[PDB]
Each structure stands twice: as structure tokens, then as C-alpha cells.
Amino acid sequence: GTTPGELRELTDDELKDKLRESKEELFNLRFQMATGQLSNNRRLRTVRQEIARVYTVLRERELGLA
RNA sequence: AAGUGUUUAAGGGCGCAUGGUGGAUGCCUUGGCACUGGGAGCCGAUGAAGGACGUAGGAGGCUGCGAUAAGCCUCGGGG
Ligand SMILES: [Mg+2]
Numbered sequence: 001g002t003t004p005g006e007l008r009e010l011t012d013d014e015l016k017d018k019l020r021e022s023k024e025e026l027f028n029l030r031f032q033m034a035t036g037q038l039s040n041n042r043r044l045r046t047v048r049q050e051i052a053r054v055y056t057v058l059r060e061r062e063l064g065l066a
Numbered sequence: 067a068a069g070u071g072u073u074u075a076a077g078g079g080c081g082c083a084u085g086g087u088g089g090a091u092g093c094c095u096u097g098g099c100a101c102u103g104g105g106a107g108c109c110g111a112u113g114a115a116g117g118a119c120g121u122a123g124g125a126g127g128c129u130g131c132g133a134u135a136a137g138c139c140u141c142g143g144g145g
């Protein structure tokens with residue numbers, strides 16, 4: 001739901017805030033699926049990829065590639 | 067009266083006609099084998115070769131991947 005272009009616009013601290021937010025959303029989704037009340041299975045994959053994106057961007061800024 | 071003489075198949079054999087079992091034969095192939103012309107001839111403490119355990123919305127194997135886990139970013143191809 002968020003693209004690498006938009007992520008590169010946020011400050012370092014805003015990215016870390018978004019990473020916590022996504023981890024909380026993933027946690028809620030896992031519980032909803034264990035309870036069997038989650039209709040859209042695909043939200044798990046998308047949230048997980050969103051976490052991976054934020055990590056990638058953060059690492060690029062440390063390595064000086066951005 | 068004396069004499070002649072067919073007439074059983076419990077089961078078996080042989081032939082033929084129809085089947086079963088079995089997977090030979092013919093015709094094949096996603097696999098092999100032997101080589102030819104090139105490439106590259108090393109990988110590893112910046113943790114290798116090879117593995118364990120994990121990883122997808124649903125059990126397991128093979129494949130891919132590593133808690134960013136059948137994937138993340140960028141540059142090109144493609145349609
Ligand atoms: Mg050498």
C-alpha cells in the first residue's frame with residue numbers, strides 16, 4: 001500500500017514509526033487468521049513486504065546509497 | 067438253449083472355440099552415454115564447500131528463499 005518512492009520521502013524517524021505501525025498491523029492480522037475471522041488473506045503478504053521495504057530504505061541510508 | 071451285439075465317464079487325454087492372469091513384442095520418450103567447438107579455471111575469517119531448522123492463506127515432498135524468509139531495492143529487457 002506504500003511504494004518505495006513515497007518511503008524515500010520520509011525522515012529517518014518517520015520510517016521507524018511506520019515500521020512499528022506495520023509490525024502491529026501484522027500482529028493483529030496473525031491473530032485474526034488464527035481466530036479464522038480474516039477474509040483477505042493477501043493482506044498478510046502485503047504487510048510483510050511493506051516491512052521489508054522500510055528496512056531496505058533504512059539500510060540504504062546508512063550505507064550512504066541515498 | 068447256445069452264440070453275436072450297441073448301450074456308463076467319477077475323473078483323465080487331445081483338438082478347437084471363447085476368456086483370465088501376466089507384461090514379452092512393436093512403436094515411442096521429460097532420461098542416459100560418448101564426444102566436438104567455445105567460456106571459466108578457483109571458493110573461504112567481508113565466515114566457503116555442504117548442511118540443520120524455518121519460511122506461502124490452507125498437511126507433506128522437491129524448488130526458491132532466510133525472522134526483510136516462493137522474497138526487499140535499483141538499473142535494463144519484455145509486453
Ligand atoms: Mg589461482
Ligand SMILES: [Mg+2]
Ligand atoms: Mg522493469
